[PDB]
Amino acid sequence: ACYXPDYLCXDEYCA
Amino acid sequence: LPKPFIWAEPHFMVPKEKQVTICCQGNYGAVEYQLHFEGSLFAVDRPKPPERINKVKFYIPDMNSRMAGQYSCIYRVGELWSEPSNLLDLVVTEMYDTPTLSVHPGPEVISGEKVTFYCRLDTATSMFLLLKEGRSSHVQRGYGKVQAEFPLGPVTTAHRGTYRCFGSYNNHAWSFPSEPVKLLVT
Ligand SMILES: *CCC(=O)N1CN(C(=O)CC*)CN(C(=O)CC*)C1
Numbered sequence: 001a002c003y004x005p006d007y008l009c010x011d012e013y014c015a
Numbered sequence: 016l017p018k019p020f021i022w023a024e025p026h027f028m029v030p031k032e033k034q035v036t037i038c039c040q041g042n043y044g045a046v047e048y049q050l051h052f053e054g055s056l057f058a059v060d061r062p063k064p065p066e067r068i069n070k071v072k073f074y075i076p077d078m079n080s081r082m083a084g085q086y087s088c089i090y091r092v093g094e095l096w097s098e099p100s101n102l103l104d105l106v107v108t109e110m111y112d113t114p115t116l117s118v119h120p121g122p123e124v125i126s127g128e129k130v131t132f133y134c135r136l137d138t139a140t141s142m143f144l145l146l147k148e149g150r151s152s153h154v155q156r157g158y159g160k161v162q163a164e165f166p167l168g169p170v171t172t173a174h175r176g177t178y179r180c181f182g183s184y185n186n187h188a189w190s191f192p193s194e195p196v197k198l199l200v201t
Contacts, residue, residue, distance in 0.1 A: 003030075005108075005192075011148075011150075014024055
């Protein structure tokens with residue numbers, strides 16, 4: 001059960 | 016000892032009441048890991064058996080403002096401690112209210128023109144954040160009563176994208192994101 005706000009999808013942090 | 020590495024999954028910007036795992040990668044065989052939060056001992060993990068482990072996970076089930084701030088970790092082999100990891104900024108988002116993002120001269124500009132974003136939230140503090148989608152490591156911080164300005168200077172197509180802003184209740188406790196503003200540069 002991984003939640004992520006739409007605006008963080010594909011964010012560079014996730015690396 | 017190699018310097019440990021610290022990160023947050025799925026992300027370091029965690030909505031209120033959502034979960035986060037803080038991972039600390041040390042060195043295979045290390046026998047004790049400590050997670051520090053703002054100068055205090057937050058948790059310890061003692062890998063047993065240690066020879067199969069080079070990283071430890073600290074789970075936070077329900078994110079809130081008391082667990083938002085700077086974290087770091089260290090690990091031990093025998094009597095020797097590593098140097099600390101870099102600092103992890105764990106930020107809680109979706110606190111309380113939603114700011115308004117505006118832009119001058121407007122969202123459509125030509126390469127060369129100066130662009131300023133404006134973040135307004137009357138019920139927050141004087142510290143605001145501007146976030147370009149995709150580029151959380153380049154988040155800009157601005158200061159203003161009621162609203163803060165974010166001058167981009169002369170822009171190029173590198174500046175094109177979707178922006179959101181946050182108000183703040185403390186350095187690591189941020190508002191809901193503004194509705195997005197797309198900047199179009201031709
Ligand atoms: C919690 C889910 C997750 O971290 N990932 C799956 N995924 C999406 O759900 C889209 C938002 C892609 N991921 C990323 O966007 C990493 C930032 C990973």
